[PDB]
Amino acid sequence: SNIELAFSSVEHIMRDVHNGYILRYLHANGASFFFMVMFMHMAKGLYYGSYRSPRVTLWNVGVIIFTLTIATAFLGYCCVYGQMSHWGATVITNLFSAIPFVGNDIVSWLWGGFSVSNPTIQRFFALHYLVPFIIAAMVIMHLMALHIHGSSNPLGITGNLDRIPMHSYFIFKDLVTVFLFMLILALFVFYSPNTLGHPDNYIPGNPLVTPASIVPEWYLLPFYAILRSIPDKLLGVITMFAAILVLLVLPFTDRSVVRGNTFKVLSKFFFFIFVFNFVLLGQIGACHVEVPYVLMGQIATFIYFAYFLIIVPVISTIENVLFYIGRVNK
Amino acid sequence: KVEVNLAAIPLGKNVVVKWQGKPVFIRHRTPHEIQEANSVDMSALKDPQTDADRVKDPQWLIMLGICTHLGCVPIGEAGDFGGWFCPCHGSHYDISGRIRKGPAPLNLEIPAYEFDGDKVIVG
Amino acid sequence: EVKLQESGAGLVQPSQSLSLTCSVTGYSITSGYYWNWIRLFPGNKLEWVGYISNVGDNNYNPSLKDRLSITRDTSKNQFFLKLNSVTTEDTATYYCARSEYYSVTGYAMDYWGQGTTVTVSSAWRHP
Amino acid sequence: DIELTQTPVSLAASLGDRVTISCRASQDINNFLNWYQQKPDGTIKLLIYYTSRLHAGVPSRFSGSGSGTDYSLTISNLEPEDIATYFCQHHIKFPWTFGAGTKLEIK
Amino acid sequence: MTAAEHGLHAPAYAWSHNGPFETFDHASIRRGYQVYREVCAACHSLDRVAWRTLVGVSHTNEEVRNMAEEFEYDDEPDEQGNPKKRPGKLSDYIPGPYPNEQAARAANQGALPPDLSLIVKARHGGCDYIFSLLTGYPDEPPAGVALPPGSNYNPYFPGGSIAMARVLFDDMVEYEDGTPATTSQMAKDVTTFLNWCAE
Amino acid sequence: WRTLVGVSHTNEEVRNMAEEFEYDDEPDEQGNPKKRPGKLSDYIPGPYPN
Amino acid sequence: DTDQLEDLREHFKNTEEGKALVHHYEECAERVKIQQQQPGYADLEHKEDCVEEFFHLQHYLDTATAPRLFDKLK
Ligand code: HEC
Ligand SMILES: C/C=C(C)/C=C/C=C/C(OC)[C@@H](C)[C@H](OC)[C@@H](C)CCc1oc2c(O)c(OC)cc(OC)c2c(=O)c1C
Numbered sequence A: 001s002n003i004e005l006a007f008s009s010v011e012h013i014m015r016d017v018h019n020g021y022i023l024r025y026l027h028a029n030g031a032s033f034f035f036m037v038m039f040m041h042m043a044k045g046l047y048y049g050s051y052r053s054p055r056v057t058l059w060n061v062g063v064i065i066f067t068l069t070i071a072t073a074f075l076g077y078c079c080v081y082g083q084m085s086h087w088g089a090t091v092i093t094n095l096f097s098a099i100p101f102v103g104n105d106i107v108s109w110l111w112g113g114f115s116v117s118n119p120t121i122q123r124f125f126a127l128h129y130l131v132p133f134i135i136a137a138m139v140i141m142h143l144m145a146l147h148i149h150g151s152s153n154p155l156g157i158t159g160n161l162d163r164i165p166m167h168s169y170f171i172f173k174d175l176v177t178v179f180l181f182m183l184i185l186a187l188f189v190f191y192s193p194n195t196l197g198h199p200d201n202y203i204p205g206n207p208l209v210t211p212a213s214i215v216p217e218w219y220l221l222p223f224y225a226i227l228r229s230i231p232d233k234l235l236g237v238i239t240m241f242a243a244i245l246v247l248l249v250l251p252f253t254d255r256s257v258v259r260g261n262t263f264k265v266l267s268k269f270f271f272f273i274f275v276f277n278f279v280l281l282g283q284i285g286a287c288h289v290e291v292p293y294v295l296m297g298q299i300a301t302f303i304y305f306a307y308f309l310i311i312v313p314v315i316s317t318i319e320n321v322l323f324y325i326g327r328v329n330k
Numbered sequence B: 001k002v003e004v005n006l007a008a009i010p011l012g013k014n015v016v017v018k019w020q021g022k023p024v025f026i027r028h029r030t031p032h033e034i035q036e037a038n039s040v041d042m043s044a045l046k047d048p049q050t051d052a053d054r055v056k057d058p059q060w061l062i063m064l065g066i067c068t069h070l071g072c073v074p075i076g077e078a079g080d081f082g083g084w085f086c087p088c089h090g091s092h093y094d095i096s097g098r099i100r101k102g103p104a105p106l107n108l109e110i111p112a113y114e115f116d117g118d119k120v121i122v123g
Numbered sequence C: 001e002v003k004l005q006e007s008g009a010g011l012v013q014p015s016q017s018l019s020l021t022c023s024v025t026g027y028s029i030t031s032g033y034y035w036n037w038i039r040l041f042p043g044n045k046l047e048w049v050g051y052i053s054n055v056g057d058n059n060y061n062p063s064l065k066d067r068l069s070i071t072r073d074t075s076k077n078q079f080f081l082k083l084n085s086v087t088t089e090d091t092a093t094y095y096c097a098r099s100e101y102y103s104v105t106g107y108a109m110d111y112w113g114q115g116t117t118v119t120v121s122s123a124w125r126h127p
Numbered sequence D: 001d002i003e004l005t006q007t008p009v010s011l012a013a014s015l016g017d018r019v020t021i022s023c024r025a026s027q028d029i030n031n032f033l034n035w036y037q038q039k040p041d042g043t044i045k046l047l048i049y050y051t052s053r054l055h056a057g058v059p060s061r062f063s064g065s066g067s068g069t070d071y072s073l074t075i076s077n078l079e080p081e082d083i084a085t086y087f088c089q090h091h092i093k094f095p096w097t098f099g100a101g102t103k104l105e106i107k
Numbered sequence E: 001m002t003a004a005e006h007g008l009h010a011p012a013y014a015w016s017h018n019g020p021f022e023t024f025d026h027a028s029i030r031r032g033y034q035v036y037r038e039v040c041a042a043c044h045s046l047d048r049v050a051w052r053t054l055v056g057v058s059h060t061n062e063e064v065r066n067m068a069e070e071f072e073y074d075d076e077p078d079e080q081g082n083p084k085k086r087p088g089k090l091s092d093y094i095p096g097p098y099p100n101e102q103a104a105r106a107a108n109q110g111a112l113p114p115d116l117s118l119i120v121k122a123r124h125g126g127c128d129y130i131f132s133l134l135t136g137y138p139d140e141p142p143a144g145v146a147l148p149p150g151s152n153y154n155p156y157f158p159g160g161s162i163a164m165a166r167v168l169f170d171d172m173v174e175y176e177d178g179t180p181a182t183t184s185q186m187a188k189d190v191t192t193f194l195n196w197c198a199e
Numbered sequence F: 001w002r003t004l005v006g007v008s009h010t011n012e013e014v015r016n017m018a019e020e021f022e023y024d025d026e027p028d029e030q031g032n033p034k035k036r037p038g039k040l041s042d043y044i045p046g047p048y049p050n
Numbered sequence G: 001d002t003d004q005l006e007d008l009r010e011h012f013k014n015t016e017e018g019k020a021l022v023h024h025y026e027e028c029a030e031r032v033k034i035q036q037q038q039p040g041y042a043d044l045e046h047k048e049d050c051v052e053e054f055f056h057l058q059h060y061l062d063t064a065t066a067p068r069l070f071d072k073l074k
């Protein structure tokens, strides 16, 4: 973790440790897959209304795990101490300098110095090791919360009438995806290890030069984009953090009397509008801060939030009524 | 505390030096840059300041290359104000180092320093 | 950029006041540095009349110090000159200029006005 | 009230050769001395400030030197619009005072 | 962002190592080493590559041992504590041309030659960009390009103004294996060696 | 050195004891190793180089 | 020996697209050369450059040479 040795120890892993590269490429790519899957897992639930009914606490725990995973991930990205590392370390810790009074103090406290230096990278490794074990704990709670009500299902109705044990069905069904998962991760680790990364990170971090090519990790982009879309320093970070916290609102704004999107025409539509919007958001993030893109980023940010706050409640209420009048002849 | 050989620095050039871990910007400004710095209405600055308040000697622009937004080092001779541009979130700085466009809330910082002939002692 | 326009009484009879106005654009009198006035005698001697800062403080030449008065209109963005009790002595061509100040280089009047030539005559003119 | 003494006063020269004007103070002005150029039409520009500093738009062929009480306004080639009146002022203490003026004619 | 700032997009040359089943062409690697040693090594370090790594890759155990013994590294002080040099060995790393960054920046008009050890991975285009750069030097910058003194125009380099000048010219190297050392043949060879160095 | 300040000696006294020794400094413009007088942030120099 | 990338850049500089592209480029250079003599080019803050056109040219040749070049190399 020593700042003068950090980057090189990582190369030592790549160049000298037996299968060291396999270890590194697996960890790095495993990090991206973690998010591709996490996003899917989140989406499925967001679609099938898993955040509803008695499963709220389940969903709320899941939201914490999301915030924690993103944190763990960023702590680890700093450990390579490449250009992206250093500057990611810088910008992100500075996110707290937005806090009104104590601001700068929280920031220099974290750094443990005048700027991102040895103290920063060494405590960051320390913490990158610690959080995973907390996530693990957080997972067992996610499981305990799951276990009292069981999983939902695509129909969005009760599954009490027809149950089948986890063993010899879902143990084997799970195996299929496990393998499929490993097959694609192997394709990246062995044949395209660096496609998901950023080249700037192969250049040792330098405190006097931020590269004109600086771009956040692909899985952070949508959030990066939302922050860039607000021309105020403080509002920029408040809005960004809000974009994550807004997911907690969902069990209260979904006014529908039935669970899931399987039978809702207007919801399925607006769901995909949200999905793609999210991708567009992440795309704007990889772009520059230039004319058509800024405004685009702002329109999309609006949509993102407007989805949980306006669309869903407005749409679901209409669908409730639509479902009613379409068959009531009192 | 750091000593920079000003006699070395040519005219239309920027120089970066390390001071307490943060980079210090020093530009040997041209007469056009100096005029362009002192000929800008405060109404167009979110953080108002005359180039006089910032520089001690109009020929040398000395400051901290730390973007006041989230801490990146702005790129020299870049932007839409012929100054510096922070690649991180798109902030623009003029030849006085004042914040023009972008999230950055304050003009680049002016450190403490004095001259001692053909050299400046920053710190 | 910056512009300074001089306008006003281009001919005045003795025992009266000399009022010249200096309109600025492309910069605010309140924002900047120093706003001076100077006159150019035919004898080719320049005399510094006095100024008014961006704050609102005056500093006049000890000579004219008790006759002149320099004020300003923030709203119209223009500073003035009012030299009371003029004599054939005051005939010269006046200029309004902006002078900066930098700790190390001192002053320097960088932006000048067109230059209005006033004549102190006993002649007549339609007001 | 310090006063500058411009000399040579109202001198002349050819159409492409160096000249040398100069101001002299009664007190000491350090280096606080500027040089202005008054065109034939009546326009008054800034050429040099604080002994050596060139203002924006003034050709590189314009030098300037000295200190204390003796200064100078050099030139490389008066070709062509150099024909004008060149003043000089101090500013170490109020009130500021200019020179006598040095006319320039192309013979 | 203006096309010039981004820099011209390097095309895709058909490298012999591109392909899920293709290995590097070691013969090309060997040639590239020579190009680096005789042309690049005067300004570019290769800090992350120890001698032992060429053995069984591009050269022989004997060959490498020889190349290493052509340089001096510090050994532990003698019996009386006085410093003393020693001829390099396989366990050492390839020595760079400069002792420090200042010496390096001094010898290149303020610029600083990046260590080539991972340049292929540290850039977009990798092999393609590296190669197109070494060859991409026109004899005259396009009309209207104000080029800073001490700078050279290369279209593939972001901003067009690179501090490195063209260094590859025909036959400036005598390839031990006979191959005609044309400027593009040399470019192909170092790049393949640089790719190996990095991966 | 600094660790003596306020314990056994004064800020000046330590600065003075420190400056009597030379320590390696960043090479100059052309990369030539040059020395420098000790400072408070330094560690008491030993008598033998190795 | 003559460099393989040059030999190819030359053959492709002399094709219809090649000559058209170099023409547009040369018509630009010729337009700039004029501006440079004209009254006060040093002061204009609008100065046109021919990079865009040099890029279209260069790009074209890249597209043509790139998939071919390596067959000629060892
Ligand atoms: C000293 C005369 C050099 C020789 C010989 C070679 N290179 Fe070089 N190189 C040198 C400098 C001054 C720089 C920096 C330029 C800048 O503006 O940053 C470089 C840079 C490179 C780079 C990276 C450039 C970039 O993309 O930022 C590459 C890819 C590179 N050099 C490769 C290279 C190779 C392979 C050489 C031998 C054939 C070679 N260089 C020689 C100085 C010098
Ligand atoms: C010990 C732990 C500490 C101190 C703090 C960690 C917690 C913070 C987070 O949430 C967990 C944080 C990761 C954030 O969440 C809002 C992510 C969405 C990241 C958002 C993010 O990333 C960037 C990034 O990666 C970059 O790379 C070079 C560069 C960046 O600009 C140049 C950014 C950036 O501008 C933003 C907003």
Ligand code: FES
Pocket: B067, B068, B069, B070, B071, B072, B086, B087, B088, B089, B090, B091, B102, B103, B104
């Ligand atoms: S750090 Fe410069 S804009 Fe965000």
